[PDB]
Amino acid sequence: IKEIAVGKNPPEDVNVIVEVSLGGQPIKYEMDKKSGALFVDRFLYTSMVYPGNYGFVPHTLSEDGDPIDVLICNTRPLLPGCVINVYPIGALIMEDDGGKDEKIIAIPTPKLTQRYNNIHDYTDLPEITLKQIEHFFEHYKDLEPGKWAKIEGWRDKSFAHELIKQAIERNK
Amino acid sequence: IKEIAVGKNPPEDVNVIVEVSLGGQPIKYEMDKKSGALFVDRFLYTSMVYPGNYGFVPHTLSEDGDPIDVLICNTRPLLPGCVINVYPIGALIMEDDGGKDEKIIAIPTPKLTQRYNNIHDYTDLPEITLKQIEHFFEHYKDLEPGKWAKIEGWRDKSFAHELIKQAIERNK
Amino acid sequence: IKEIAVGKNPPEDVNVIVEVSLGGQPIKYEMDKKSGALFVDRFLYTSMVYPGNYGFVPHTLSEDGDPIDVLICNTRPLLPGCVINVYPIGALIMEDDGGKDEKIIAIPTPKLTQRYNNIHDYTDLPEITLKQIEHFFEHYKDLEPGKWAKIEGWRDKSFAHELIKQAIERNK
Amino acid sequence: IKEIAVGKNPPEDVNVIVEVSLGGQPIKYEMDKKSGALFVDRFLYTSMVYPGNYGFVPHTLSEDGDPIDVLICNTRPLLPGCVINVYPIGALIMEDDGGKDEKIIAIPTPKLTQRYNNIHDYTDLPEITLKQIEHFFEHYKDLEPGKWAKIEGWRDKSFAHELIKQAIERNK
Amino acid sequence: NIKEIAVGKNPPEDVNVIVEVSLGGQPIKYEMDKKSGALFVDRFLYTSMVYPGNYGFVPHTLSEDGDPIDVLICNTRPLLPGCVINVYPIGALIMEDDGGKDEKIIAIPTPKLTQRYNNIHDYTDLPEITLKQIEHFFEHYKDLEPGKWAKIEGWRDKSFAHELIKQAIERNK
Amino acid sequence: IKEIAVGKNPPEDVNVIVEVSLGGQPIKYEMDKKSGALFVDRFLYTSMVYPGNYGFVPHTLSEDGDPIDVLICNTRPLLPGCVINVYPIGALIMEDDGGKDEKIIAIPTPKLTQRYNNIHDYTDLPEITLKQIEHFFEHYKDLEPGKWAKIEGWRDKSFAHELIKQAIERNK
């Protein structure tokens, strides 16, 4: 990780290290800090699957001690452990049993694919895609004891930029 | 379907025509009465997948005019359109936008696999399996306009037997 | 087949019997007229895969004597032999080694999925998607001796509607 | 099936109605005589998978009383219920718990794929492929109570032709 | 970096298993290379079989023959080769092969990872057919490999698996 | 990568670090020298898939300063980031937007699989396999801006050996 850059021109683009593939098996891998290995954090407790590829941006630190989380809302499953350059386009704001949880929403950049050339902001994604993301994060831990999430709402790309920018600073 | 039997010794065993495969793609096929072909009824509106293989028993008719639905709680996906012989072991009772809805829970017979030899009643399944099934039927239609469901509770194998027996006689 | 309608309100929507799944195995199935069974027509001779689910609309007849073909430009693979209700949104006009070939381009209806709500015409699809579809039909038979194809251009939803209406009338 | 031909020029080529896909899930589907539907006959009792696509030739009848069995030795999985035209190239001769058992070994024809152009006899296949086929049929039933198989040996294409021709006459 | 992966939290009750082969799927026997940490293709299986569980090894363990403790995880879902998963040993399959004594731990995911196995405490809690398929697999999967062979001795219990693991942790140090 | 040998007895066998799996998803991974991580270089811009598992030989260097690239023409998909020992059996020679471009064609060794025992030279592969490989590399970048490719021709195993040998000493 120490030699994976945050991105080329962050926060406009960031590199995401993928932990969980969209769809497929309900297996929540999590990269371990100390070893760089992907551990199985858990199998999902609900009959749900990730609505996009999920991972984190290296060399970022949130207020709560974790790297910036990102849900990549493309349609193809990516290998856990790979790195993908993406455009943040928004953020999903939630409150969970552990406090404030803000997840960046991102798309692959045009160099990787031309499929998203007209997606510049989370509001350009289909409405049902946004709702599914909300509903996933709201309910995927329903059968884990003591665990809940409430959806506050969505914030725009400029907010996602600022959150990333500040997480980069907090890391240094 | 006319030459497909209800089962060998219904209601102890029944044949289920599978419409939707456990896991995999969130595509809800439904077998069309008149044509016998599998139609795409919808893609699921939530980021969920079926917690078992799902289908219906031919030549049965529930109170509200549909064949008996069965969730087969094995672990391997089955081909939509196939027929599998199963033992009912319980029923999940619910109330949705359409009124009462019973779902039979079933396992493959010992002839098909020896993996479930110690499962004789829905209560022999792991507790988390039953909760996931409840939670699935509770939430999978959450983002479909006007659709809702609540869990009433579980009923035992004898109850499922009685429910199937009723629907066979009603079909005649 | 006789019990499968052309559509609900054709040509605005049509039912497509799917022969080939998007992506996955490069196996071209074709439904046999006389038996109704899916036959293997061939394995593709090139290292390509269908860029959409592909099939035909029953009870239609083109000038050639074949049913109207449709490429459904959604992202998930559909079971060969299923039926899916779609909206035609345009047509791809081509020349084959066997004469003029017109393919309907279509999307699933909003009842099946809310994901394409703002797609009303083939020009709303991403530009790269259209180019890939052209490129696919242009090249997938390159290594089949004596077979070839050239792209003439695209026609709008109105032309597609007219093509289908004429094909429905030709069938009667 | 009553409109599916035995082949174009049998026994040189025959149509096989595929029941079990190569690899993938250990699910032995079987087409029901009186229904045409694919029933799950069983899950394999051993941790094995079919080494080719497996099915039967319609309108044939072996001395046993079931249609001729064919193992298609290509590498890509085929849809159960599909029909594929193949060249018989040999036969595997076996004895099991219910008498003599011959399996035709077959490859897809050159029309479907050019990959097997220099395969004219079962002995043209890699030796390991033939050994894997023997070993599969020898062991896949090892954990089924009262079932067993012993391999007798292989016969050539000529014998396979004669086996199929006698089975065609036997059906009539 | 295996050096920073722990044997487990409370070993031998739980251990961490670095996964090398996924259950089912492609008959591809990856093996992790000591020297590089890379997953090498050791071979494609020579028989038309597939692994009946996810298979890998416990780091920082050493058997008498110089190899780490081997574990077959008998869950139902395929795991990514090279991931790490925390499991409860619940028994051992005892075999002899061309290499000498071969004792493979059987294990299940811990309850934190999944609540599906809460009533599985020992290998004898698994369905019999599952145990017989595991025996049958190890007995036959190398049948067509030249010079390779395997004989099943039988099964041993969780306490045995614990002692085997304890002795392999001390042997590593 | 420092600890992965070029091979056991190169150039007769070489170790290949796999970047892209045969078939499956059109995701072109590439290993970063400095980090060692697999990055997504791009999604394919055409509806094509790799006709073999594709990677590079560590500690080799072409005259362009890249490692020797290898297409492994086996049939089963390999995990990106795994290492596999293969026999070079020839080379495909091409010109691209980058300049000179030689791709080694390779098969797995006999130790890994007995399936290719009679394959000693690229000419032993089926003709259609070679045509597919050429066609793939000829066209897979057709919709990438500024990118182009022309097939020069194929060269034999000895040329392959000589190419690898020169890239080995070039790295030293």
Short mmCIF file of C-alpha atoms in Angstrom, two decimals, chain A:
data_model
loop_
_atom_site.label_atom_id
_atom_site.label_comp_id
_atom_site.label_asym_id
_atom_site.label_seq_id
_atom_site.Cartn_x
_atom_site.Cartn_y
_atom_site.Cartn_z
CA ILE A 1 0.00 0.00 0.00
CA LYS A 2 2.77 2.48 0.90
CA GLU A 3 3.52 2.80 -2.85
CA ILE A 4 -0.11 3.10 -4.03
CA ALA A 5 -0.83 6.82 -4.54
CA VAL A 6 -4.05 8.43 -3.21
CA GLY A 7 -4.80 9.27 -6.85
CA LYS A 8 -3.33 11.27 -9.79
CA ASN A 9 -5.15 14.56 -9.11
CA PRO A 10 -7.08 13.94 -5.89
CA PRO A 11 -9.80 14.42 -4.87
CA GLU A 12 -11.03 14.70 -8.51
CA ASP A 13 -9.76 11.12 -8.96
CA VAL A 14 -8.89 8.59 -6.29
CA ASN A 15 -7.47 5.06 -6.26
CA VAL A 16 -9.73 2.59 -4.51
CA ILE A 17 -8.46 -0.73 -3.16
CA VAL A 18 -11.38 -3.11 -3.68
CA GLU A 19 -12.38 -5.27 -0.74
CA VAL A 20 -15.78 -6.56 -1.87
CA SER A 21 -17.00 -7.39 -5.37
CA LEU A 22 -20.41 -6.27 -6.51
CA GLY A 23 -22.98 -9.07 -6.38
CA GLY A 24 -21.67 -12.66 -6.31
CA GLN A 25 -20.97 -14.20 -2.91
CA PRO A 26 -22.01 -12.33 0.25
CA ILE A 27 -18.43 -12.27 1.55
CA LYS A 28 -17.19 -9.17 3.32
CA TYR A 29 -13.43 -9.11 2.91
CA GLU A 30 -11.54 -6.47 4.75
CA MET A 31 -7.95 -5.54 4.20
CA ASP A 32 -5.89 -5.85 7.38
CA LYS A 33 -3.71 -2.81 8.19
CA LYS A 34 -0.77 -4.67 9.76
CA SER A 35 -0.34 -7.39 7.08
CA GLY A 36 -1.98 -6.18 3.86
CA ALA A 37 -3.91 -9.47 3.62
CA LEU A 38 -7.59 -9.69 2.81
CA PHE A 39 -9.35 -11.30 5.80
CA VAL A 40 -12.90 -12.55 5.84
CA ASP A 41 -14.61 -10.06 8.17
CA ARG A 42 -17.88 -11.92 7.90
CA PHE A 43 -20.40 -13.52 5.65
CA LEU A 44 -23.32 -11.14 5.36
CA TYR A 45 -26.01 -11.92 7.98
CA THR A 46 -28.75 -11.00 5.54
CA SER A 47 -29.67 -12.41 2.11
CA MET A 48 -28.23 -9.31 0.46
CA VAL A 49 -25.35 -8.52 -1.87
CA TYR A 50 -23.28 -5.40 -2.37
CA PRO A 51 -24.87 -3.09 -4.93
CA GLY A 52 -21.45 -2.02 -6.18
CA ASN A 53 -17.75 -2.71 -5.75
CA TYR A 54 -16.63 -1.58 -2.37
CA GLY A 55 -13.32 -0.53 -0.94
CA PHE A 56 -11.21 2.21 0.48
CA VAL A 57 -8.79 4.99 -0.53
CA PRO A 58 -5.29 4.48 0.89
CA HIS A 59 -3.50 7.27 2.82
CA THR A 60 -6.77 8.82 4.02
CA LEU A 61 -8.05 9.06 7.57
CA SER A 62 -11.57 9.98 8.69
CA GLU A 63 -12.36 11.54 12.09
CA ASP A 64 -13.13 8.03 13.36
CA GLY A 65 -9.70 6.50 12.55
CA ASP A 66 -10.57 4.62 9.30
CA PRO A 67 -9.71 5.26 5.67
CA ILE A 68 -12.26 6.83 3.33
CA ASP A 69 -14.84 4.24 2.22
CA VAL A 70 -16.01 4.15 -1.43
CA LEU A 71 -18.85 2.39 -3.25
CA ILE A 72 -18.06 2.16 -6.96
CA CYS A 73 -21.35 2.03 -8.86
CA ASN A 74 -20.33 0.29 -12.01
CA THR A 75 -21.94 -3.00 -13.12
CA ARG A 76 -19.02 -5.47 -13.41
CA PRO A 77 -17.52 -7.33 -10.41
CA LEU A 78 -13.92 -6.47 -9.65
CA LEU A 79 -11.29 -8.75 -8.04
CA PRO A 80 -10.91 -8.03 -4.34
CA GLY A 81 -7.37 -6.72 -3.81
CA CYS A 82 -7.22 -4.83 -7.11
CA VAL A 83 -6.85 -1.09 -7.41
CA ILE A 84 -9.11 1.11 -9.57
CA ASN A 85 -8.97 4.78 -10.37
CA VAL A 86 -12.42 6.41 -9.99
CA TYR A 87 -14.24 9.77 -9.87
CA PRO A 88 -16.02 10.58 -6.65
CA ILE A 89 -19.46 11.94 -7.65
CA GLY A 90 -21.27 12.11 -4.28
CA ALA A 91 -21.62 10.77 -0.78
CA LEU A 92 -24.22 8.86 1.18
CA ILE A 93 -24.61 10.21 4.74
CA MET A 94 -25.77 7.84 7.45
CA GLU A 95 -25.89 7.34 11.20
CA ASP A 96 -25.19 3.91 12.58
CA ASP A 97 -24.73 2.25 15.99
CA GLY A 98 -21.10 3.52 15.85
CA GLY A 99 -22.00 7.18 14.98
CA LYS A 100 -21.51 9.13 11.68
CA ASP A 101 -20.81 6.96 8.58
CA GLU A 102 -20.19 8.78 5.27
CA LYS A 103 -19.62 6.68 2.12
CA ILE A 104 -18.29 8.16 -1.08
CA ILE A 105 -20.04 7.09 -4.31
CA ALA A 106 -17.75 6.84 -7.35
CA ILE A 107 -17.63 5.76 -11.00
CA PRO A 108 -14.73 4.51 -13.08
CA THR A 109 -12.91 7.26 -14.96
CA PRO A 110 -13.16 7.78 -18.75
CA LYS A 111 -9.72 6.30 -19.35
CA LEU A 112 -10.97 2.96 -17.96
CA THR A 113 -14.36 3.10 -19.65
CA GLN A 114 -16.42 5.47 -21.84
CA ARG A 115 -19.67 4.01 -20.48
CA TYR A 116 -20.05 6.79 -17.87
CA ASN A 117 -19.09 9.87 -19.87
CA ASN A 118 -22.40 11.54 -19.03
CA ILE A 119 -22.28 10.79 -15.32
CA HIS A 120 -20.81 13.82 -13.56
CA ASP A 121 -22.72 13.81 -10.29
CA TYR A 122 -24.56 11.18 -8.18
CA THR A 123 -27.87 12.75 -9.36
CA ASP A 124 -27.10 11.53 -12.90
CA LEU A 125 -27.24 7.91 -11.71
CA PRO A 126 -30.63 6.30 -12.06
CA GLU A 127 -32.86 7.01 -9.08
CA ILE A 128 -33.42 3.34 -8.33
CA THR A 129 -29.63 2.83 -8.09
CA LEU A 130 -29.36 5.47 -5.38
CA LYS A 131 -32.35 3.97 -3.53
CA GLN A 132 -30.88 0.46 -3.68
CA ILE A 133 -27.61 1.72 -2.25
CA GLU A 134 -29.49 3.45 0.60
CA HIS A 135 -31.59 0.40 1.27
CA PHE A 136 -28.57 -1.90 1.24
CA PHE A 137 -26.66 0.12 3.80
CA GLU A 138 -29.80 0.62 5.84
CA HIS A 139 -30.61 -3.13 6.07
CA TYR A 140 -27.59 -5.32 5.43
CA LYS A 141 -26.72 -5.54 9.16
CA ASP A 142 -30.32 -6.05 10.29
CA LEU A 143 -29.66 -9.52 11.62
CA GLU A 144 -26.34 -8.62 13.32
CA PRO A 145 -27.08 -8.14 17.04
CA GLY A 146 -26.98 -4.49 18.21
CA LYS A 147 -26.42 -3.12 14.70
CA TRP A 148 -28.54 -0.53 12.89
CA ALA A 149 -28.27 2.23 10.31
CA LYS A 150 -30.40 5.25 9.47
CA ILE A 151 -30.09 7.16 6.20
CA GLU A 152 -29.57 10.90 6.64
CA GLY A 153 -29.32 11.66 2.88
CA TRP A 154 -27.03 12.34 -0.10
CA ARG A 155 -24.47 15.11 -0.55
CA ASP A 156 -22.92 16.28 -3.80
CA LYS A 157 -19.58 15.75 -5.52
CA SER A 158 -18.08 18.98 -4.01
CA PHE A 159 -18.83 17.63 -0.55
CA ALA A 160 -17.20 14.30 -1.43
CA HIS A 161 -14.18 16.27 -2.68
CA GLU A 162 -13.93 18.18 0.59
CA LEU A 163 -14.30 15.03 2.73
CA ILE A 164 -11.51 13.31 0.78
CA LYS A 165 -9.34 16.46 0.83
CA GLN A 166 -9.67 16.62 4.63
CA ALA A 167 -8.99 12.91 5.10
CA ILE A 168 -5.78 13.30 3.10
CA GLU A 169 -4.74 16.17 5.41
CA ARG A 170 -5.72 14.26 8.56
CA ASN A 171 -3.49 11.38 7.42
CA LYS A 172 -0.36 13.63 7.17
#
